[PDB]
Swiss-Prot record, chains A, B, C, D, E:
This is Receptor-interacting serine/threonine-protein kinase 3. It is found in: Cytoplasm, Cytosol; Nucleus. The gene is Ripk3. The chain holds residues 441 to 461 of 486 of the full protein. Coiled coil: none annotated. Serine/threonine-protein kinase that activates necroptosis and apoptosis, two parallel forms of cell death. Necroptosis, a programmed cell death process in response to death-inducing TNF-alpha family members, is triggered by RIPK3 following activation by ZBP1. Activated RIPK3 forms a necrosis-inducing complex and mediates phosphorylation of MLKL, promoting MLKL localization to the plasma membrane and execution of programmed necrosis characterized by calcium influx and plasma membrane damage.
Length: 21, 21, 21, 21, 21
């Protein structure tokens, strides 16, 4: 688990739902 | 678990819901 | 699990749903 | 599991649904 | 599992559905 730059996400079972229109 | 730049998130089972319109 | 640049995501069972129109 | 450039994703059983129109 | 350039994805059973019109 290592992040150098921005906009990075680490995590198991990390669900993500985008914004519906 | 290491974060260098900004906009970084680390965590297991970290669910995320975007803003619905 | 190593991220160098931005816009990178690591995680097993990490489902992702895009924003429906 | 190694990512160098951006726009990279590593994770088993990582389903992805595109945004329907 | 090694990614050098961008737009790369590694993961078994990683289903992907394109956006229907």
């Amino acid at each position: 688990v290592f992040n150098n730059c921005s906009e990075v996400q680490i995590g198991n079972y990390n669900s993500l739902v985008a914004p519906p229109r």
